[PDB]
Amino acid sequence: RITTLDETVGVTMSHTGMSMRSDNSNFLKVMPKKEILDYLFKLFDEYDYWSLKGLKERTRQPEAHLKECLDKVATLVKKGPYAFKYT
């Protein structure tokens, strides 16, 4: 049969409402334009199909120099296979 909870009624309901406790069970808890271009030329030369993520991770530097200074001699497509590719 069922272990009809022998406790007093008051104590058991304490944790049901706003008990202000949680996470006790871990579960669903969840910059040189020279150097940039030299790498941008390297990015273009090493793999013309160079995505921004493959470049930004390889940038390992301020986001400004890689994305902006390289935007001149490198053409980036948006859709299709060779897209976002500093080719």
Partner 1 sequence: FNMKLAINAKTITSGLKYALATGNWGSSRAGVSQVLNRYTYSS
Partner 2 sequence: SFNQFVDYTLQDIICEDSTLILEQLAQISRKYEISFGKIYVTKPMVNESDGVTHALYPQEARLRNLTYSSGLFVDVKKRTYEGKVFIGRLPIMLRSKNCYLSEATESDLYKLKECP
Partner 3 sequence: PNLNIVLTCPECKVYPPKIVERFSEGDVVCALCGLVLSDKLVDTRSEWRTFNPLLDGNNLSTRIGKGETTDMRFTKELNKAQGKNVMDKKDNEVQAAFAKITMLCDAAELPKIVKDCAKEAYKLCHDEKTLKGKSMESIMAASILIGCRRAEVARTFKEIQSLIHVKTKEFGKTLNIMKNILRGKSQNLTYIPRFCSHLGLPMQVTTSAEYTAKKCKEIKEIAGKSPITIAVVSIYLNILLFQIPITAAKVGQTLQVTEGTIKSGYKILYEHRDKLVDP
Residues of the shown chain interacting with partner 1 in the complex, contacts defined by CB under 8 A: 16, 22, 27-30
The residues binding partner 2 (CB under 8 A) are 1-5, 7, 9-10, 12-13, 16-17, 25-28
Residue in 1, 5, 6, 22 binding partner 3, rule: CB under 8 A:
22
Q: Are 40 and 54 in contact (CB under 8 A)?
A: no
Q: For residue 82, give the H/E element and its range.
A: none
For residue 3, the minimal CB distance to partner 1 (Å) is: 19
Q: Which is nearer to partner 3, 17 or 81 (CB)?
A: 17
Closest CA to 86 of 38, 49, 58, 60: 49
DSSP state, residue 57: H
